[model samples]
Target: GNDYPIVLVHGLGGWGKGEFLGYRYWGGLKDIEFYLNQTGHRTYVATVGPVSSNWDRAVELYYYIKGGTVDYGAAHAKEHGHARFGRTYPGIYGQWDETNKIHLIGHSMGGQTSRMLVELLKSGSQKEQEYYSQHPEEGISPLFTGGKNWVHSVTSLATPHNGSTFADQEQIVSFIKDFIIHLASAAGQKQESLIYDFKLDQWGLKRQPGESFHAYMNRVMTSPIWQSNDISAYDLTTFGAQELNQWMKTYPDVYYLSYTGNASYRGVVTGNYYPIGTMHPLFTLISMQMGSYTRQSPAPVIDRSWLPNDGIVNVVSAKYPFGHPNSPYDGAIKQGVWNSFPVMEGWDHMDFINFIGSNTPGYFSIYGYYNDVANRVHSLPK
Candidate 1:
């Protein structure tokens, strides 16, 4: 019944299967890919720029699937002050194309990156085309030419589809910086004494030899990449998401589905959302701040609708992009429109990937949940 493979994409501060010491990003330590495969589904997990903008990550993803050196587009690189070429991959799914399309499952910011890739594949970037038009010798990458339908379905799990209030908080960079480093150490990676690779090679920001973790962290935290709107710092804000949504259009050929997690409940007295007792320890504090905060200066004010969160992304934000075409999943899967899935209460952001909080509801099973997802996508018409 299955006609395509599923590519698992991790969110911001995530690494590929190769980076960690066999600890799977899709399963943490459970190896969800293996489970899905054994059950008759083909799957591959991809690694892209952990903190890069969706545009750069989208470019990296295209090469990762089709197998080639990553070309971030000449004009994009020039505008963002980064290199035009990046590391190469053997093309995890070497046969990916319009016929051998794939199902992309992204968590957190990876959701945004998934949409970006499909958008590029649907309508190639005119900006890059114009750049290549002037420099024929440069030879534009096929990814920039668009007119390809290489994706079968996009499923976003606990994604910040509309960005998060967490980025607006002070010390946001510190939180993001430390999170990945901790991931590196947990995965037993110690190259250059850096637990995790920041993977910002585009800006030529790699860990230097003899660089202390603090020094490397400081350098990255203070880098000019944040100023460019091309980084995740910009894409994860309410205004940032609004700007991105302005151009992220849905095609009439690709199927879209959104899944949400809710670890916070409304406070009857304070009219705010407070994290359930089971929220991940790392997110409880920030979750509290995001529960009732609002930004007034911004045009799209972060109001009550942005309160109920999954300790990382707001439930409403993860539900679907506002002003987009979407409807409930009524047993009929539609392409070029968003199909909403039922909310998983007590399911925190990390729980979707089996990071933690698997026991909150005492009845939720991360493995079985994804198994259902795999079956649904597998049953789609090729």
Candidate 2:
């Protein structure tokens, strides 16, 4: 395999055209760029939709790559697959941009979009899929598309393949989020996007039509995806400890690298617990309630596992799926491997970039913490 250019996609509300609030996520692509460039990997920036619920972001992203300037809303309602829309749009993944097939590195929800892109490359349309398959540099699919040798590789940061119990555990945000997620699902139908797969039935979220993302999550939470003690509340709310364990047994195709923050397993039957760092009461309030069908509950943990998650995302909740030796719930995806690193003690998700040396905590101010990740990923087998 040849070393490919690295294209980055930010997570929800992470895409940006320029810096903001004394920092930049997407705009500061150069932050990561400097590191990857030094490693001899060409790094590219991808502009997906906003943090809001919209598949149009992918479409917009597709167009943006091709040098198209379609606005977000206008892009949303259109049926714009390469074949359906026609023309060899190089900006779209494979149709035109053959010279520079990009390797993907996505965070949070962006990871799922990358998966969708790869899946489509394997089996979308006869002509388009066949063409995409032949051109592996696009980084779509190497399995079915005959793209195995073409793609560079994929590295997803904090992607919830099995979904998150935290989504179901948001107390104040649940009511509003439920309706918003549903609306997004409705939009997904028109766009054929997979954003809906991030939720479950009860919360009006699902991976596919009529299924629940919650169910997938509940199944994986306590299941083998990550070790957990057997407990009904935990079980009912999690991705299912046993089911995920069974899935791990099958060993799916894909490289998996899981990263988790806090959490110490208590034991399946005993129900381990990992507390939310500095936010224990908040988690308990959101995840576990007085008792009702429509209540959110937190996942289990040991006695003293507490770490800083992004403000909204707890380190434990953001843990990579395949269980890491260091992390109890480093969950796994098929064909995937696992490796994890904490965000330098107190660095929040935002701290990944926002904080400068003086602005950030002393621990985070130390260089090489995040650069090490960039260096390590750049060194992956090409």
Candidate 3:
């Protein structure tokens, strides 16, 4: 019924094959995976940590599909203070290999995670392999070993591949972050999964063997790692994205697609402002802040082109692997090179997943979009 199984990955603060407050992160009121399966398209929705880094989440995703225990690596776990292994799943799905590759469709951070997964599969991390080679008993998870082409294609929707200017605006991002931190602190509550998902200890900061959770939190909160711990806001910055791209490369055998959206419009009077007409009121404030921001020392300045956004991600940033060839949307699909679809106008970030409060109005179906893309992939030379 399908050439390759299709996997749907959610963006930031998202979940898959699960519900949160009676909400499905992938489809607000629909089970897209089920619908696809019923329509003869083999599909699976991947469940991953909401605020985890691309690397950590990628590892989790690999184990999830393979139905195996998640090994965060011996050295990685020791340094991070988390258990070396996590939940396990029996091998129910078909094996992932060169002959049985899968197609990945991710929104937001999931896009990065999918890319990292492909990279890890093809070229295992040098440090991770070196550590595993020394300790033969650690039982390495093949994820870190690499040297395999197990992916057919990757499609990113509204993913901040080159980082979002929204995160770079210190005055605005800091103000909102501080307010949220204060509120969360006042309530004496923490998003356990979100906080733990950061995997800070894996990113150069090590937690003491017997360190208390409260103590660790206190220390990390006071350090630079805190800014990057949860949600990877720091990693979504321009500088952080550039560092990652230095190593990220496109696989010639795999297809790449990027879909972006734009809801903000140019104002005749104010130049470019997010109108309050159809967009969510929150974007108005975000657009105002990002609109006035301009980089000085960061080499390439953040210009007006970066101002147009879909409430969350900047439109241009969604077309990833900058300087790559991109053609206008002509109903054609290709592999190796990034083929960015025309930006969907008047659509907001959450609209792609049909969020409850999505800015998109009228009869629209993200399911239909996925079905069409799946068909396009099926039509490609096999």
Candidate 4:
């Protein structure tokens, strides 16, 4: 069986091949694409919006691979109060199509975005089609045409399929955005100019010249994008994930798989999940609160089932899509069904990328785990 090139999509707050100065969003310091390619598997790292909604990210992803300036759909932009256009890229794997499809491996929010792309590819956007009908001068992008299969397999690693409760914690969510920016700015400082970009031009939130990091963050935080549900903040919530799950369908023509991280253990005293010492320090604080936090007033009840987590995404949330039929990987392969691996014992959200899991026992190296995925998807029939 011939292997299709594997496309690696990064999670929220991510950077691309050129961004972060040789630091890969896939493996942090390690180069996942180079390693996979040297091992006889072609791999491509696809970068989308770092903090955009799955809808916007999916649209950007299509153009990133297809080669064009990103058009966020006329009706969608008007409704969201943003520009309809975005940055362009020289297509990577321009031959992407049903005959020459690629496998998608997304971590965290990228997983949701990956599913969004597949759904749009198959169903297209009738609203967008209607918009084009009114104005024939602006032709419709083929992505909204509704009849194509350009993906062979989709693997979600440490993804919030059902969304995490942390998104609901107003006590923390209100302040989390500030911490993320302050933290990102420190890491992105390789030169006199900051390399970090929100890629939120659609919402008119780009970095300005000679602006201080503190000032830039202030502008972003106060921007009207937060007022709308089109941003990532809302989409990362339990309610947001539920809305997405209802719309996205499991395609019978493509293979689907899920992998999860469970680095926390049930506390004997509190009866809640707690992060292990081996986890990245960044997730330690939030993971503690998310493990015990419960929301009864909300529609999506946050109960004990949401306890086990991998720092950012809950272990159960990473298992599979709620309505989709899924089974633990049992050697037999199936299409359109979610075949997930066993809970990765003592594995943190960052461990999947080899960011800081070298010393952790039972940790799966980025190369070892991805090589297996590369070969597995390579055997599937497109």
What are the models' TM-scores? 0.94, 0.49, 0.81, 0.93
User: Model 2: which ten-residue window has the lowest total lDDT?
Assistant: 80-89
Error of 4 at 239 (Å): 0.4
Decide which is better by lDDT, 2 or 4.
4
- Itemize residue pairs with steric clashes in candidate 4: none
Best prediction by lDDT: 1
Specify the poorest-scoring 10-residue window by lDDT in model 3: 193-202
Over 108-137, each residue of candidate 4 has an lDDT whose tens digit, in order, gives 888999999999998999889998999887
Residue-wise C-alpha lDDT for candidate 2, range 325-360, written one tens digit per residue: 222323322234334444434433334443222223
**Of the candidates shown, which would achieve the greatest TM-score relative to the real structure?**
1
lDDT of 3 by residue, 88-205 (tens): 7664354878888888889887888788788888887776778878987776777788788888888888888888787676443353344334323433446342233223434444
Residue 95's lDDT within candidate 1 is 83
Which scores greater on TM-score, model 1 or model 3? 1
In Å, residue 54's CA in model 4 sits off its true spot by: 0.5
Better of 2 and 3 by lDDT: 3
CA error at residue 100 for candidate 4, angstroms: 0.7
* TM-score, cand. 4: 0.93
Determine which window of 10 residues in candidate 1 has minimal summed lDDT: 356-365
The parts of candidate 1 lying over 4 Å away from their true place are: 181-194, 210-214, 360-364
lDDT of each: 0.83, 0.39, 0.69, 0.81
